[PDB]
Automatic annotation (TrEMBL), chain A:
This is Phage tail sheath protein. Belongs to the myoviridae tail sheath protein family. It comes from the Bacteria.
Amino acid sequence: TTVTSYPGVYIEELNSLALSVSNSATAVPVFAVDEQNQYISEDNAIRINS
Amino acid sequence: TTVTSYPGVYIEELNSLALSVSNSATAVPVFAVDEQNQYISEDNAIRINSWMDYLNLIGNFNNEDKLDVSVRAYFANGGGYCYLVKTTSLEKIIPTLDDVTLLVAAGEDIKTTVDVLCQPGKGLFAVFDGPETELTINGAEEAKQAYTATPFAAVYYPWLKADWANIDIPPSAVMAGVYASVDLSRGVWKAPANVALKGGLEPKFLVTDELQGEYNTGRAINMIRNFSNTGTTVWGARTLEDKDNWRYVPVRRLFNSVERDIKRAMSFAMFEPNNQPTWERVRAAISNYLYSLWQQGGLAGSKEEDAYFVQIGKGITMTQEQIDAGQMIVKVGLAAVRPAEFIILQFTQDVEQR
């Protein structure tokens, strides 16, 4: 863990495993567009917000 | 003991065997420099402390040469002091050195020198660098063939590419700094994987998850993988050996730093006469070291009778005829913790069944 070589003040911050569970993005869909639609670029997930 | 010749006051200070175990220098690496680098002197372990201390050797030229980039990337990740030796005289300098415990190849192909160097008794777990070329998934049987399976090694696949110093950084010198950073921060028993690289360097080759499936078995190659949560992280704690005992670089490097902290303490009790007063001090001093690791969580088990055991005594470990040859025998057991390589989650809909 810590090595003590020279006389002095050693600060070492031991911290326990902080574990918490985040809940986010329950229903985020994807839309398989029509193959004929020329505006969607080929093989790229173009993302829209509103 | 004392002789009484004249009438007077005699002061004699009898003192018992004071034995304590010191833990220091867990991960201090050496760098096999390139043979062409003219600045390293021939057959001398020139020792550097920091990058401003290293810059007095050479004031410029951070950009191109592969040793010069590697030690710059080493100090950026983790802090330590490292010796620099030429690979020609690598086997001559390392046995006569104080604390060299990571023989780190800074891209120099020194596999033969490593095998000659480290017996099972010495220690010095020695990391390697992966092949700088592309590794496909169906060419897995040949890419493992170059490395020979030994439990004192570790391979890291993708050579790293940084913004500064546009030549390719070898992954072995980068991972050498993460070892000294993890062993200082969270101790030696915690696995050196799952730690983001503090230097601003990205992997040159992207890692598919199915590509890591058939490489992280057998004599495994650990793989540095970058994903979005933590950036470019190291993602392998396996060594080059596939058996149940010595599968992990935390379970290997804990048995190096315990078998070197006790060996320095045994020099104080070296020529002490072995009877019941002597090997009660040696038993009680070793068992306090193995108790201090258990309170830190380095050893598994519920209570201290299961985490470790130490046995010295006439009878129990050595017979009478071995005492007459003057060799006392210490048996030491350790249950080192192994990392959670595959955390699995089982979900049932039967909650009253339990």
